[PDB]
Design an enzyme around this catalytic site. Structure first.
Site, PDB file in Angstrom:
ATOM      1  N   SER A 145       0.864  -1.192   0.000  1.00 44.45           N
ATOM      2  CA  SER A 145       0.000   0.000   0.000  1.00 44.45           C
ATOM      3  C   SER A 145       0.896   1.236   0.000  1.00 44.45           C
ATOM      4  O   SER A 145       1.741   1.370  -0.902  1.00 44.45           O
ATOM      5  CB  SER A 145      -0.984  -0.091   1.154  1.00 44.45           C
ATOM      6  OG  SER A 145      -1.685  -1.314   1.120  1.00 44.45           O
ATOM      7  N   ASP A 253      -8.249  -2.516  -7.016  1.00 41.04           N
ATOM      8  CA  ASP A 253      -7.754  -2.299  -5.664  1.00 41.04           C
ATOM      9  C   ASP A 253      -8.737  -1.452  -4.862  1.00 41.04           C
ATOM     10  O   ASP A 253      -9.275  -0.458  -5.358  1.00 41.04           O
ATOM     11  CB  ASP A 253      -6.379  -1.633  -5.717  1.00 41.04           C
ATOM     12  CG  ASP A 253      -5.813  -1.346  -4.345  1.00 41.04           C
ATOM     13  OD1 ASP A 253      -5.048  -2.191  -3.833  1.00 41.04           O
ATOM     14  OD2 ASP A 253      -6.117  -0.274  -3.782  1.00 41.04           O
ATOM     15  N   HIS A 297      -6.948  -5.641  -1.434  1.00 41.96           N
ATOM     16  CA  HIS A 297      -5.920  -4.653  -1.114  1.00 41.96           C
ATOM     17  C   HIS A 297      -4.870  -5.351  -0.263  1.00 41.96           C
ATOM     18  O   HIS A 297      -5.216  -5.941   0.767  1.00 41.96           O
ATOM     19  CB  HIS A 297      -6.534  -3.456  -0.374  1.00 41.96           C
ATOM     20  CG  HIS A 297      -5.607  -2.290  -0.212  1.00 41.96           C
ATOM     21  ND1 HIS A 297      -4.930  -1.724  -1.272  1.00 41.96           N
ATOM     22  CD2 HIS A 297      -5.261  -1.571   0.882  1.00 41.96           C
ATOM     23  CE1 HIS A 297      -4.200  -0.712  -0.835  1.00 41.96           C
ATOM     24  NE2 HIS A 297      -4.384  -0.598   0.468  1.00 41.96           N
TER      25      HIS A 297
END
Ligand SMILES: COc1ccc(NC(=O)Nc2ccncc2)cc1
Ligand SMILES: *[C@@H]1O[C@H](CO)[C@@H](O)[C@H](O)[C@H]1NC(C)=O
Length: 351
Positions: A145, A253, A297
């Site tokens: 991330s 995502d 994610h």
């Protein structure tokens, strides 16, 4: 487990001035080192950083960090869980700078918070060089991330840092997970007036000024003064990088859809299908990549990261093929991008 070390240079700090640090497993057998960058959004002004400090303080302070952590996924030392690098030296660097690992500014009179993400990475590397990294052959800088975006911003700075310190034999590489964002057309639009309405391009533009953020020099030279926000977006900064970088990105995502103001009618169907197509296009010329058609994610430190497959190949296998390619290979591919157009059309997607 991985054991906590606070930085000896206590002027390299988290947001509130507490010392930054890293968690370390050692593996005397191995000359391979994995340095993982944690994620977790960011803040870009006094008011939304103050909010983050009340309810997300571990991402802004080391005062409450535990002594140890357990490695999971790619940070696991058990081959059953980590077929890729289970015997490597493991390092987990906590994300406590709220700057997408880009800042270089201290807490001073004029700064309520310190934003030192870029300096945290060099200080960890410097102190690890006295603990065996001096003898390494591969340094893999990984992250998920905002940590994945941090890999793209810092992988060449780590290379540069080791060249200047006199370690030309260490091969620096990058593994960016879920940090390949698009500055695309949003599904619904709002002018940037507060945290919830500010698009990524506008929020990062403000953040760079607030953090004294730094980007790779070759990318900065293209977009020039004031336009450094471009270098936070993978498809723009990747072609300027010299270190080998493996890109892991879900096609749909969840963080991308969130900042696109998506939370199914025909208009939204077309939008979601177009997002997968646009992401798929930006990876066309990325030789080392893993992009499944799932709504999710993050992946690489999840304990069941070995389950998902693209075209019959798992991510640990794809990463192993990447290692072999850096010594195409028969039956050991490195470019794996799904072509089916809807979330979870790949049956191996996580539940
Ligand atoms: C281009 O650079 C970046 C862009 C986006 C992020 N992540 C992010 O916005 N996360 C988020 C989480 C919860 N609510 C809203 C947003 C990180 C880096
Ligand atoms: C601590 O880190 C800062 C920032 O990188 C640097 O300027 C300073 O020289 C370091 N201190 C020591 C003793 O190395």
């Amino acid at each position: 487990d991985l054991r906590l070390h606070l930085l000896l240079n206590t002027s390299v700090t988290c947001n509130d001035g507490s010392p930054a640090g890293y968690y370390l497993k050692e593996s005397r057998g191995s000359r391979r080192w994995l340095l993982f960058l944690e994620g977790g959004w960011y803040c870009f002004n006094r008011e939304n950083c103050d909010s983050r400090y009340d309810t997300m303080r571990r991402l802004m302070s080391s005062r409450d960090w535990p002594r140890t952590r357990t490695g999971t996924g790619i940070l696991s030392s058990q081959p059953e869980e980590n077929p890729y690098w289970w015997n490597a030296n493991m390092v987990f660097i906590p994300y406590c700078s709220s700057d997408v690992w880009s800042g270089a500014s201290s807490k001073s009179e004029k700064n309520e918070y310190a934003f030192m993400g870029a300096l945290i990475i060099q200080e960890v590397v410097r102190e690890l060089l006295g603990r065996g990294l001096s003898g390494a052959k591969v340094l893999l800088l990984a992250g998920s991330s905002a940590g994945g975006t941090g890999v793209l911003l810092n992988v060449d700075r780590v290379a540069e840092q080791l060249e200047k310190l006199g370690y030309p034999a260490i091969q620096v590489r990058g593994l960016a997970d879920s940090g390949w964002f698009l500055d695309n057309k949003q599904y619904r639009h709002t002018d940037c007036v507060d945290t919830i309405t500010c698009a990524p391009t506008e929020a990062i533009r403000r953040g760079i000024r607030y953090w004294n953020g730094v980007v790779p020099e070759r990318c900065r030279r293209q977009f020039q003064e004031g336009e450094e926000w471009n270098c936070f977006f993978g498809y723009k900064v990747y072609p300027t990088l010299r270190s080998p970088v493996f890109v892991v990105q879900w096609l749909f995502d969840e963080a991308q859809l969130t900042v696109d103001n998506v939370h199914v009618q025909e208009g939204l169907r077309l939008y979601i299908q177009n997002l997968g197509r646009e992401l798929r296009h930006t990876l066309k010329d990325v030789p080392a990549s893993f992009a499944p058609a799932c709504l999710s994610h993050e992946i690489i430190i999840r304990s069941h990261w070995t389950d998902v497959q693209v075209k019959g190949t798992s991510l640990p296998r794809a990463l192993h093929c990447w290692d072999r390619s850096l010594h195409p290979l028969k039956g050991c591919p490195v470019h794996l991008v799904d072509s089916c157009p809807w979330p979870h059309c790949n049956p191996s997607c996580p539940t």
